[PDB]
From a paper:
In mammals, LONP1 is a primary quality control protease responsible for regulating proteostasis and various biological functions within the mitochondrial matrix through diverse mechanisms. Here, we determine structures for human LONP1 in three different states: substrate-free, substrate-bound, and both substrate- and bortezomib-bound.
We show that in the absence of substrate, LONP1 adopts an open, left-handed spiral conformation that is bound to ADP and has its protease active sites organized in an inactive conformation. The substrate-free human LONP1 reconstruction identified in our dataset was resolved to ~3.4 Å resolution, which was sufficient for atomic modeling of five of the six LONP1 protomers. Due to the low resolution of this uppermost subunit, a copy of the middle protomer from the five-subunit spiral was rigid body fit into the low-pass filtered reconstruction for representational purposes. The presence of a fully ADP-bound LONP1 conformation, despite incubating the sample with saturating amounts of ATPγS, likely stems from two factors: the LONP1 sample was purified without supplementing ATP, and the presence of contaminating ADP in the ATPγS stock. According to the previously proposed mechanism of substrate engagement, the topmost subunit of the left-handed spiral is the first to undergo nucleotide exchange upon interaction with substrate, followed by subsequent nucleotide and substrate engagement events that lead to a reorganization of the AAA+ domains within the hexamer into an active state that is competent for substrate translocation. The similarity of the substrate-free human and bacterial structures suggests conservation of this substrate engagement mechanism.
Author numbering:
A (entry chain A), B (entry chain B), C (entry chain F): 421 to 595, 603 to 947
Write the structure that this text describes.
Amino acid sequence: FRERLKELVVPKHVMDVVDEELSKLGLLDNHSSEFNVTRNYLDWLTSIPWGKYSNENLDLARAQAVLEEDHYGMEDVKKRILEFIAVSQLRGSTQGKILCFYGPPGVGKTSIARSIARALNREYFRFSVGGMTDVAEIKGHRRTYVGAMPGKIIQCLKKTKTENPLILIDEVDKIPSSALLELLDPEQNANFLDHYLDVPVDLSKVLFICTANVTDTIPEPLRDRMEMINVSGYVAQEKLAIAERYLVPQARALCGLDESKAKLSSDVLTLLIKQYCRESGVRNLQKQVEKVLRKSAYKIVSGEAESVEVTPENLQDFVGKPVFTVERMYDVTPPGVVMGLAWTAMGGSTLFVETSLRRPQDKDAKGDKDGSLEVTGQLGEVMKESARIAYTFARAFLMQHAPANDYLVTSHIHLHVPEGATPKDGPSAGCTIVTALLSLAMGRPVRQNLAMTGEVSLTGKILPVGGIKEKTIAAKRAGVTCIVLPAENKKDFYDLAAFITEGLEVHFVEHYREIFDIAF
Amino acid sequence: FRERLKELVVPKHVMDVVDEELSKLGLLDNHSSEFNVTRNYLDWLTSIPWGKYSNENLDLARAQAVLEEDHYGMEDVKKRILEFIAVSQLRGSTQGKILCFYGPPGVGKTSIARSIARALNREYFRFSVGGMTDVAEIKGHRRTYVGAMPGKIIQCLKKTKTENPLILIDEVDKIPSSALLELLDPEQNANFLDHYLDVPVDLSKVLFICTANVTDTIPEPLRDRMEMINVSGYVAQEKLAIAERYLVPQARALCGLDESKAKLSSDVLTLLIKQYCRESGVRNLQKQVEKVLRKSAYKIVSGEAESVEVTPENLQDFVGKPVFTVERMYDVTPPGVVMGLAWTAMGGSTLFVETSLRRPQDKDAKGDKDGSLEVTGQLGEVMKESARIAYTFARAFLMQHAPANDYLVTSHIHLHVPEGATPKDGPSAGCTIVTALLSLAMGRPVRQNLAMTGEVSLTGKILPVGGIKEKTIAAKRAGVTCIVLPAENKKDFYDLAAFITEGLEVHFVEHYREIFDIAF
Amino acid sequence: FRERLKELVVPKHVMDVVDEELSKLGLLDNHSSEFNVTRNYLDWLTSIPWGKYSNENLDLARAQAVLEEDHYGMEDVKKRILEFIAVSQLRGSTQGKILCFYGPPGVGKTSIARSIARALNREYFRFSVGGMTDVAEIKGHRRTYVGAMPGKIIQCLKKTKTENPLILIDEVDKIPSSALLELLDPEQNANFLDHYLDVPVDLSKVLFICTANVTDTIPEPLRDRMEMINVSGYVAQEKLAIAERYLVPQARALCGLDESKAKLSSDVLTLLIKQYCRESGVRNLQKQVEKVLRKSAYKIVSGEAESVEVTPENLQDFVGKPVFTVERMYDVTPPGVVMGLAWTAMGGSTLFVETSLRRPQDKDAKGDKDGSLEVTGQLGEVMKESARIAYTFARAFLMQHAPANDYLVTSHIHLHVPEGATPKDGPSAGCTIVTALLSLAMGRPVRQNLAMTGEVSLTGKILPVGGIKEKTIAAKRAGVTCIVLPAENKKDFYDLAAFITEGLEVHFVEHYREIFDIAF
Ligand SMILES: Nc1ncnc2c1ncn2[C@@H]1O[C@H](COP(=O)(O)OP(=O)(O)O)[C@@H](O)[C@H]1O
Ligand SMILES: Nc1ncnc2c1ncn2[C@@H]1O[C@H](COP(=O)(O)OP(=O)(O)O)[C@@H](O)[C@H]1O
Ligand SMILES: Nc1ncnc2c1ncn2[C@@H]1O[C@H](COP(=O)(O)OP(=O)(O)O)[C@@H](O)[C@H]1O
């Protein structure tokens, strides 16, 4: 091509390489593998827009409106993109900074990235690195191998044709970390130089967005040079608002109907949200709404009616009987059972820690006859030592609260902590395990709707934990009233919306004597 | 021919390159290493259509009539396809979805794919991805390679000559998966970019069907993309209906016979179903049918008989003595063996959990040594943990129901849980294990036809399980008369057809105390 | 082409190679794979410098100014570079010594490297051999590869184009090590012998600089040729000075502001340091400062205000509630817990060891019945043996100091050493373990703000430890006043800056009896 190279602002290096390329095309003859190689290399080097970028949209109020009018919530993503706009304005050129959205699945991480692109007026392009093993798919490979293609980044640059295409590397925590590093690095950016080509490409001003469900698996070489932002799950009422304003409209558009035919009530949407779904995003809720509208469309095209109104009285005919008929596993907990607030890789959960005697306690202690503890729940070494520490503090606390009670000392116990949480949050069930052992020993059940979370140590101190937002959302959607937290987490509980702290009686504690007071 | 491309309807983007390569092809004479094959590079694209989307019928009445004519049951698939047609008619265009049918072997998935194709009037094309590893076949190679094969999707487009051919991938749970992803991903769908053709195709209109036996093997990036529909097994009377109405006609028209030439009886068909087959599908049933029919054919053509008619008494002259005389391993179960339903990759099943004693009891054991338990059955870690939990609960439940009994606490037992259940349905034999240990310890057997299933917790809560339809079918076909289910599975049992749940006596349950009260 | 060599010194050795290869190219015909391959090999052979040296600055005062004016502290590195320039001067040219910086992350182990490249007027280059595993990325491939590119230093010479480039090997802990030796070995520095270049490549002039968090996981063969220099962390005052001189200006410039619009007061900077960061470097502080500055930029551009002055009473707006609202775990320690002063891979850190008495005292029953010690903290074998040594010594010391006390000898204890230290510094908690055991046994706490370290042997001899600078910095950060050290560490405690050793009363000891007399 001639105008392709003409209209762009290309550097002397690529000018030299394309000059030698034209020369080689002038030295070879038709019908030759060499000429095919040279011509494909030429078209590759010619298809990239150098110095050609897209004029971004920098009105603060217009960006705010674009962001807010097609996504509920996500206030911190909105704030961050607004700060990005403001810095790119106070500077001259474009910025091109790296981000990472982490949170449960189905909360809006990819759609918010599309909307960020639509607000920046930049082009868009995405790809995943969950099912990726070859460095080739990122950095290409030389023109010598038979099947030659340039590693999806030059493929991008072609497919989008602009200097700052807002890439989206989905699912970076489930991965070729070498090429990923070489791509996400302010100092290793300005020249990339994939294997296929031999010219270095200048991608310093493209803003990469990444996604992940959990930070703790993004390799630290990346995690260091990548700014983390949380996109948390929703409570029933935010799920309802999301539903009414975005889920049902575009489902109707997808199934070809309109509002004057298929009407979903707020009552049936809450019935869906509370009975037919359990996640903390809106993925399965959207599946159910699509099912409702498909069966509506059928009952219309057939002719069973001309307009369908879905109300809790006739819901079953569209989807069926409710799948989640209970709120928790236990309504009123027996003695050795306590409710904790696990932080999983899909949001939160209210997991039940259960203890039970394992061998008859009929023994007058003729001699030493120590007790023991058996533990299950696929525990690692960190969690096994946490359970030992919690066992020992339980012994030592019942040693002084009621010395006559030799249950925990001379008795064989089986403890079960279910397998939800992530290894970082694993040893956050310390106070739950302590309460479970103590309730089994005393023969008294815990307070009824009481969920707790926090780390415990031999001396009894309650150390802080993470994931307070997700744990609180899970306690909320599991029907919890009281909630015990480490008094060093009073920050990230009093910054949640008043939606999530409606009727939660929260107790911020420093030592386990306080948890023992409240829980009894 | 230029006539063909000219006839095609507006692939203008492709036509640019089509000219830029075809004028060069025709520019160079034959006897040219490049031209010989660049004629193929033209013929392929010329054969691949671009604008023709074959007529699709949107008649709900006729589509229902054709669906219910050549496939018994499968009303889930039939409802889904009817909703599909209704939606594709409400939208003025064809749409194209991505559906995946899962179920045991021999339930009709491929055959109903054929029926769907001929019912929507779309073309048809199937292929397998069972043991394929290379991406050379799902996406094709490039010209640099010595071979020349444009994959399978381009092959389909050529063979059918339409852009909505309803491709059918088989054994998708046995796959290399990146290409399947890029194929069935509506994000990466609108453009495909095979290797042998650098031109994109609009697959956003074909109706992808996948068939899998077990959904769990389907990698997650696909499992969340395809819509998973279940096709269940077949009770005996449904098997008989299928054989009478479809299998015997197919085998006849396979061996050139007629209703007067060679006839099979309903009584001999039931006899065959019950004695010569054990599966949940109808594959072995059709194999027996076609063997009987080809034996009949040999007899007739040799003239050893005329007007051959198969009866229960001359059936042994065709297939010999039965294969499965006995219903199941036991009819009267001794102490320590109970019948548990399982959900294997082959569908439902009925297995027997067995317990035995390993070391003699008689011992005035000084020191009060602790009883043990050796679990065999080729278990995973999850099943080992779950058997520990069931063991502890059995000991604890006996400790308070029969305080004098010390069988479980101090004795060395061996538990064999037979190995059929999928890794997901592993810890579903929990209540059968508890019952086996308890019946061994109490010396008494459980009541006769008392299959059961459900997860058990450390304090006894019976937790819901999956695969209820398959398990109910396999309890039906084993002489089971009382099945014991977790209470939260009513929404799964009370929606089975009237003939499936016909003779059963079902006890839904929430805590093991009641399973104990209805087993002893 | 030749015009490169037309003015460039090349060795008589490689000259025969290049001329023989030009001949063996001139005999063969173009439009050939072998033509392109030999051409590429020659282009690599010629793309590298062979005699040209950067006219390195040798003005001692110039290099000293260049250093001093872009880094606070690092006296050791700056002195070493000044002496290196001195020897470079007194010789004709220099040899490019090997060097290694070690210390906590975020202290400047890279920016000082680039400043050194500046003051030597060489260029810069870097690469990390942490994440890699194969020696390919360093040693390149032979001529007989499918299609290859050379080792890393070849790309370095291509993108630097002088014989002494000052490259930087990074993350030398996470490592092939033999290859890095053959690279960093004087006798064979002058001979690389990349399989991609048959001629020996000299490297006897480039100075390599490596980086590390800890010098113990660097393999000894490499460590023999590396001259170790330490770059420690900082204290509150040093962090404040770096933030005022470097961090705030660099961030403001990055954001596109000026001095008058956005300013951060000394109070708010010490607030950020002491409150929103718990590191030893300034890595997180950089993020916490440019976050403030981009929120400032938002307020400015978006018209919220035309000037901003971030102050201690409006910082919570810019960042949020304080993150770290506790200097340490216990303000006043119970009996049985002592501060630890460990030296983790991330830098110094104060740790608390606890003891609990996991089992009742038994009321001086007649039996001999020795006590025990369960230990948690994810130890190694050396640490478990050091714990047993501390246990024995504590029992013995209590025997000969309060012979009437039976606690340690007949009692079952639970010790927990937190899992923070390094493997080599593990047995630097012996005196903390002894203090904790004796504190629990006697039944009374230790001096309030007292931290200790040092190894202990059976006879109670305190043995010297390492990491005194980092332990002292940590002890300062955690608000410790009294610090107890081995008497053989006054060499490296008294060479410490007056910043660090100011507020601390420091007790050097030789035996444990003095630690006792101090702690009680
Ligand atoms: N706050 C929200 N506003 C509007 N739509 C939302 C919101 N949160 C989730 N959704 C919808 O939920 C669906 C989840 O898909 P997606 O966000 O792509 O999954 P993931 O978050 O794993 O990328 C999207 O279709 C999106 O439209
Ligand atoms: N419900 C049914 N109605 C009619 N034919 C059936 C039915 N179920 C199974 N078949 C017969 O079984 C065979 C289909 O087996 P197939 O579905 O290919 O096995 P798989 O289930 O492993 O894909 C066909 O001959 C089909 O006619
Ligand atoms: N002593 C110092 N003098 C000046 N700036 C410093 C100093 N220490 C750290 N910095 C700044 O902090 C950042 C440190 O990051 P970096 O040095 O790359 O981490 P590492 O030390 O692990 O290589 C740099 O931006 C640097 O400007």
